[PDB]
């Protein structure tokens, strides 16, 4: 028995997984939901994830569903190296971070609410460009500034080791420059992105390194 | 210095953070942010947050933002009641539980975005009420189904207890029939919210309960 993770390349909810993994240096074999072909959305992907989203995690015991619950389960199952801070104040401040991506930009931009937009709305490509900007822009406004006011940090979103935080951050990034937002805005979040960019977990999570990539 | 809970009474962050706090019997002294006439949108609140969303909790040394992270945070530094389980699985399933409302159905009805949809899209109510049920509907099914595989679950979303879970799917439920959504098809979830809504905690938290409410 191993892990199986049933994952899309590009998709900034598998990839913020991705980078967690890698980091923990966790092997899994990936297995590919292709999206576009909406196989999540068959009845064979609704027996192991009932929400037919992605990621799923199987243990190889059981399937794990929800990014956000799967990173902090990896954080305490393979403590090395750590992905969270040790004191609560410094855990607050990552979680929140990270909140702020996963609860108010990713949601808002996903598949199904862009197509839901197009087919409901009548939105076409410039509507849902200004749309997904609007959520990007407004979170990372609020990312960038609190990146401002922590005296103690290093190269990353919280100290000078990635944590939870930069995994939500970078695929959150590449999002927004596939919706071309302007990040000129946000040279601090830039700088982080660049930073993990330069790391093998990241480099090795990141879309275009996927089996399933074009 | 004592807790300072900027927040509002009509909202489904400020009531799930209410929930958790009166769990954990911590005082803290209301803040009314009045949403309705936008004061969340005022310089003064952005000094507090600049994400300029509720709640935010002034703990008399900072102001904590992101509800999720400040429930984690209330978990670690008020223990009793436990609010997640012991073991790693039940945690998993439990910010699992709290995930799915938390990401995939309470930002996409939000304020902003309802504002969006009626003011870039030209959404009437009936078009924003179908678009509520649309996301209510998809997370309450796959909530609803996972309630169902849990052998071991009492009255609440998880065991015997309340936890951080219902904290956030009680407020969720709330939104629900604000926005006439259907709540037929989920028995499990319409009985946990039952038995929540007999505890003292969880009724002084409610919307109606709040010293802003009508
Ligand atoms: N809170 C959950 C959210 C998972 C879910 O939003 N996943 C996306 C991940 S793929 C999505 C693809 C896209 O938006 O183009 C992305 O994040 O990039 C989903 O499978 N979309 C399919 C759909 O909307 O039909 C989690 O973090 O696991
Ligand atoms: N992830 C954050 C989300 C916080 C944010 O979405 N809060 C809402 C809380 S109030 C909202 C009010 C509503 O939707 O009518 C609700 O949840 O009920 C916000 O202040 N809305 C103001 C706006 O959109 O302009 C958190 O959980 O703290
Ligand atoms: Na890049
Ligand atoms: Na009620």
Redesign the interface.
């Known amino acids: 028995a191993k892990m199986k993770l049933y994952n899309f390349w590009r998709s900034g909810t598998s990839h913020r997984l991705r980078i967690a993994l890698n980091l923990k240096g966790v092997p899994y074999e990936y297995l590919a939901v292709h999206l576009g072909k909406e196989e999540h959305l068959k009845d064979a992907f609704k027996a192991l994830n009932?929400?037919?989203?992605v990621p799923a995690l199987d243990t190889g015991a059981?399937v794990?569903?929800?990014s956000?619950?799967?990173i902090?389960?990896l954080e305490?199952?393979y403590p090395t190296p750590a992905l969270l801070p040790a004191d609560?104040?410094g855990?607050?401040?990552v979680?929140?971070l990270?909140?702020?991506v996963?609860?108010?930009i990713?949601?808002?931009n996903n598949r199904?609410?862009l197509e839901?937009?197009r087919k409901?709305?009548?939105?076409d490509e410039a509507?849902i460009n200004?749309?997904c900007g609007?959520w990007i822009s407004?979170?990372f406004?609020?990312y960038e500034?609190?990146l401002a006011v922590d005296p103690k940090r290093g190269r990353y979103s919280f100290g000078d080791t990635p944590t939870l935080a930069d995994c939500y951050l970078v695929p959150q990034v590449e999002s927004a420059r596939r919706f071309q937002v302007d990040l000129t805005p946000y040279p601090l979040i830039r700088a982080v992105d660049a930073a993990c960019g330069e790391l093998d977990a990241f480099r090795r999570a990141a879309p275009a390194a996927q089996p399933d990539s074009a």
Not at 50 to 53: E, G, I, N, S, Y
Not at 120 to 123: E, S, V
Request: aromatic content about 8%; glycine content about 6%.
């Open positions: 009932p929400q037919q989203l059981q794990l569903i929800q956000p619950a799967i902090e389960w305490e199952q609560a104040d855990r607050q401040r979680r929140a990270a909140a702020i996963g609860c108010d990713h949601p808002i199904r609410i839901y937009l409901t709305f009548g939105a509507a200004a749309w609007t407004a979170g406004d609020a500034a609190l």
